[PDB]
Amino acid sequence: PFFPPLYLGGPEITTENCEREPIHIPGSIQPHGALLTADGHSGEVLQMSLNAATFLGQEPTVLRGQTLAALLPEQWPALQAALPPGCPDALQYRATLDWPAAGHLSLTVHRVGELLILEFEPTEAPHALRNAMFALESAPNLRALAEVATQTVRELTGFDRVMLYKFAPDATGEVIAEARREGLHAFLGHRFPASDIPAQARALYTRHLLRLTADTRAAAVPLDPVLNPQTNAPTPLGGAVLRATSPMHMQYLRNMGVGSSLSVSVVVGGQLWGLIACHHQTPYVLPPDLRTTLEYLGRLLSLQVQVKEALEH
Amino acid sequence: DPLPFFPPLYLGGPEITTENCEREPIHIPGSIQPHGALLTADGHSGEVLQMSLNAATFLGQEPTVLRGQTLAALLPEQWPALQAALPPGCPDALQYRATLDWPAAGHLSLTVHRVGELLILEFEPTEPHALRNAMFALESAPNLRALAEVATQTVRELTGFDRVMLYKFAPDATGEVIAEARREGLHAFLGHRFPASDIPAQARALYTRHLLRLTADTRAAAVPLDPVLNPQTNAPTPLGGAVLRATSPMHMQYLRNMGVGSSLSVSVVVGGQLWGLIACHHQTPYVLPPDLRTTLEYLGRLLSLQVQVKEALEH
Ligand SMILES: *C/C=C1/C(=C/c2[nH]c(/C=C3[NH+]=C(/C=C4\NC(=O)C(C=C)=C4C)C(C)=C\3CCC(=O)O)c(CCC(=O)O)c2C)NC(=O)[C@H]1C
Numbered sequence: 001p002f003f004p005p006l007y008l009g010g011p012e013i014t015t016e017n018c019e020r021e022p023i024h025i026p027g028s029i030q031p032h033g034a035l036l037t038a039d040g041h042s043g044e045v046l047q048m049s050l051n052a053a054t055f056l057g058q059e060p061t062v063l064r065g066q067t068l069a070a071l072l073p074e075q076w077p078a079l080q081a082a083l084p085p086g087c088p089d090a091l092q093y094r095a096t097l098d099w100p101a102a103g104h105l106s107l108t109v110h111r112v113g114e115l116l117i118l119e120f121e122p123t124e125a126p127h128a129l130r131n132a133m134f135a136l137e138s139a140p141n142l143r144a145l146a147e148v149a150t151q152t153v154r155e156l157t158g159f160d161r162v163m164l165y166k167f168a169p170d171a172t173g174e175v176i177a178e179a180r181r182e183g184l185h186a187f188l189g190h191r192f193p194a195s196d197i198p199a200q201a202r203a204l205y206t207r208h209l210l211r212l213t214a215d216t217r218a219a220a221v222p223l224d225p226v227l228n229p230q231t232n233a234p235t236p237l238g239g240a241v242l243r244a245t246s247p248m249h250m251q252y253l254r255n256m257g258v259g260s261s262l263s264v265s266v267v268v269g270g271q272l273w274g275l276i277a278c279h280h281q282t283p284y285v286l287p288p289d290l291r292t293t294l295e296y297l298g299r300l301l302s303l304q305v306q307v308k309e310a311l312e313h
Numbered sequence: 314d315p316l317p318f319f320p321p322l323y324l325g326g327p328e329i330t331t332e333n334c335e336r337e338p339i340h341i342p343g344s345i346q347p348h349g350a351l352l353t354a355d356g357h358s359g360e361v362l363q364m365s366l367n368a369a370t371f372l373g374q375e376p377t378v379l380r381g382q383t384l385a386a387l388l389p390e391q392w393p394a395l396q397a398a399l400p401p402g403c404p405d406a407l408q409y410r411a412t413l414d415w416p417a418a419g420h421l422s423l424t425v426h427r428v429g430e431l432l433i434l435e436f437e438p439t440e441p442h443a444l445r446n447a448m449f450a451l452e453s454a455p456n457l458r459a460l461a462e463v464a465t466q467t468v469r470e471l472t473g474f475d476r477v478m479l480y481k482f483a484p485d486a487t488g489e490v491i492a493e494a495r496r497e498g499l500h501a502f503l504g505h506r507f508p509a510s511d512i513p514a515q516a517r518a519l520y521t522r523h524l525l526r527l528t529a530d531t532r533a534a535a536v537p538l539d540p541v542l543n544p545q546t547n548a549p550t551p552l553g554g555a556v557l558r559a560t561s562p563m564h565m566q567y568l569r570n571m572g573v574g575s576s577l578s579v580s581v582v583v584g585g586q587l588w589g590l591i592a593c594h595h596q597t598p599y600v601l602p603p604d605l606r607t608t609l610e611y612l613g614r615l616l617s618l619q620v621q622v623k624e625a626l627e628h
C-alpha cells in the first residue's frame with residue numbers, strides 16, 4: 001500500500017521506502033500554471049491553487065464561491081458533454097480561452113469521481129509532425145526507428161537531450177537511442193536498476209502518458225484547501241499535468257544538473273514498453289500545443305514499435 | 314484467379330470490362346485529377362521531366378520555361394530540404410510536406426515523394442483542439458462498437474461528408490459496413506455485406522502501403538501527364554504514391570450510378586494487413602484541403618492502434 005502524505009503526517013521518504021510514497025496526492029502543483037477543482041454537478045469551485053489570482057486575475061475569495069457556469073459561460077456545457085459522470089479519468093478535454101487578464105490560456109479538464117479538475121496554462125495563437133509521421137513509418141528497423149524518434153523530438157522541441165529508454169522484463173532499463181546537443185555526457189547504451197522507477201509510478205504511467213517538471217528548483221504551490229471538501233480526503237491529481245513532483249525525484253535531477261524534464265509513455269500491448277525522455281539544462285516550459293505534438297508522437301511510436309518488432313520475431 | 318496487369322490504354326492495351334477488372338493497371342494512369350498540379354523531376358540533377366497539362370495554371374508559368382529550369386532554381390528554399398528528407402534508395406511511401414508562398418496561386422501545399430531516380434512533386438491550394446479531444450475520446454471507448462461509432466462521428470464532424478462509414482474486411486475479403494454516421498434522409502448502409510470482387514486484388518496490395526486516396530469530382534476529366542512516358546526509362550510513370558493520381562474510369566462510372574460526387578477513404582492497417590476502410594461519401598463535388606486531410610491521416614494511424622487494443626480485449 002501507500003504511506004499517508006506528508007501534510008497528513010506520514011513518514012518522510014528515504015531510499016528504503018521508495019515504493020510507498022503517494023505521488024498522486026501531493027496536494028500541490030508546479031507554478032507555471034493554475035489549478036482549480038470543481039463539483040461535477042454544480043460546478044462549484046472547491047479547491048484552488050494559491051497562485052490562481054496570478055493567472056486568472058481574480059480576487060482570491062471571488063473564485064472559491066463562484067460556479068463554472070458563471071466563470072466559464074461558453075466552456076461549461078462543453079465540459080458536461082465531454083466528461084460525463086462515469087467516464088475514465090484518463091479522458092481529457094481542452095479548449096483555448098481568450099481570457100481578459102492573460103491573452104490566451106490553455107484549459108485542460110478531466111474528472112475524478114464527483115470532482116472536475118481544471119488546469120490553466122499560458123498558450124499562444126506546421127508540417128513537421130506529418131513529416132515525422134512518415135519518417136517513423138519508413139524506418140527499416142527498430143534501431144533506425146529509435147534514432148528518427150529521438151532526432152524528431154529534438155528538432156521539434158529544442159531539448160538538449162532526448163533519449164528513448166526501453167524496459168526489459170524485470171523493469172531494467174536501457175537507453176537505445178539518443179539525440180543530444182554537443183558537449184553533454186552520453187547516456188547511450190547504459191542500463192539502470194529497477195528501483196529508479198518504483199512500482200507505483202509504473203502503474204500510473206501505463207494510464208497517463210505525459211508528465212513534466214518545468215523547473216527543478218521551483219517550490220511547489222499548495223492547493224487550498226488541501227483536502228477535497230467532498231471527501232475530506234486528498235484530491236487525486238495523478239492525471240493533472242501541473243501536479244507537483246515528488247521532492248525525492250527533484251533532488252536527483254539537481255544532482256544531475258537538469259533544469260527541466262519531460263517524458264512520454266510508449267505503451268505496447270497494455271504494458272509500458274519504454275519512454276521518450278527529454279532533458280534540458282535550464283528551466284523550460286513547453287507550450288501546450290507543442291506538448292500535444294509529443295502526445296501524437298507517443299501513439300505513433302507505440303504503433304510503429306509493435307510493427308517493427310513483429311518483423312524481427 | 315489473380316492475373317498480371319494489362320498494358321495501359323495509351324500503350325495499346327485493351328479497355329476494361331467486368332471480366333478483366335483485376336488486370337487494369339491502376340497505378341500508371343498517366344494523368345492527374347484537375348484540382349492540383351503534378352511535376353516529375355530527376356532525383357539527382359533536379360531536371361524537371363514531366364508535368365501535367367494544367368501545371369501552367371496552378372504555377373503561373375509556361376510549360377517550357379518550367380521544364381527548362383531545375384528544382385534548385387524553381388524551389389531554392391525547398392530543394393535542399395527535399396534532398397535531405399528523401400535520400401536515394403528511400404521507400405516510395407516516405408513523403409515530405411512543405412507549404413509555399415507562390416506569387417500567382419496563393420499558398421501552395423507541396424507534397425514530395427521519390428520513386429527510383431524520380432522525384433514526384435504535387436502542388437495543391439492550401440488554406441482547434443478537435444483532433445486532441447478526438448484522440449482522448451477514441452482511447453476511452455469501452456469497446457470496438459463504441460470505437461467504430463466515435464471514429465465515424467468524429468470524422469464527419471471534422472469533414473462534414475454526407476456519409477462516413479467504417480468498412481471492415483473478413484478473412485475471405487468480403488466486407489461489411491460495421492458503423493456509419495450519415496446525413497438526415499440518407500438510407501442506412503449499416504450491416505450490409507458486399508462481395509470480394511468489389512475491391513479487386515491489385516488495389517488491396519496498393520492500399521496497405523499508401524494510406525489515403527480521394528476522388529474530388531466523379532465527373533471531371535483526367536488531366537494528362539506531358540509527355541505521358543518518363544523520358545528516363547520510356548516506361549510509364551509510377552503514380553501509385555500520388556494522391557493526385559487520376560481514378561480508373563470503371564470506378565468513376567459505378568459512383569455516378571450511386572449519385573456520389575466526391576469520395577475519400579483512409580486505410581486502417583493492422584498487423585501489416587488491411588483491416589478495413591474509413592470511407593466518406595458526398596453527393597456534390599467536394600475538395601478537402603491538404604492540412605485537413607493530414608488530420609484524417611493521423612486518425613487513421615490512431616484508429617489502427619486503437620483497433621488492435623480493442624480486439625486484444627476480445628478472445
Ligand atoms: C527512493 C526513490 C527513488 C526514485 C523515485 C522516483 N523516480 C521517479 C521518476 C523517474 N525516474 C527515472 C529514472 C531516470 N531518469 C533519468 O534521467 C535517468 C538516467 C539518465 C534515470 C535512470 C525516470 C525516467 C522517471 C520518470 C519521471 C520523469 O518524467 O521525470 C518518480 C516519480 C515522480 C512522480 O511521478 O511524481 C519517483 C518517485 N528515484 C531514484 O533514483 C530513487 C532514489
Ligand SMILES: *C/C=C1/C(=C/c2[nH]c(/C=C3[NH+]=C(/C=C4\NC(=O)C(C=C)=C4C)C(C)=C\3CCC(=O)O)c(CCC(=O)O)c2C)NC(=O)[C@H]1C
Pocket residue numbers: 330331332333334335337339502507510511512513516559560561563564567576577578590592
Ligand atoms: C471491374 C471492376 C470493378 C470495380 C473497380 C474498382 N473499385 C475500386 C475501389 C473501391 N471499391 C469500393 C467498393 C465500394 N464503394 C462503396 O462506396 C461501397 C458501398 C458503400 C462499396 C462496396 C471501395 C470502398 C473502393 C476503395 C476506393 C474508394 O473508396 O473510393 C478500385 C480501385 C480504384 C483505384 O485505386 O484507382 C477499382 C479499380 N468496382 C466494382 O464494383 C467492379 C464492377
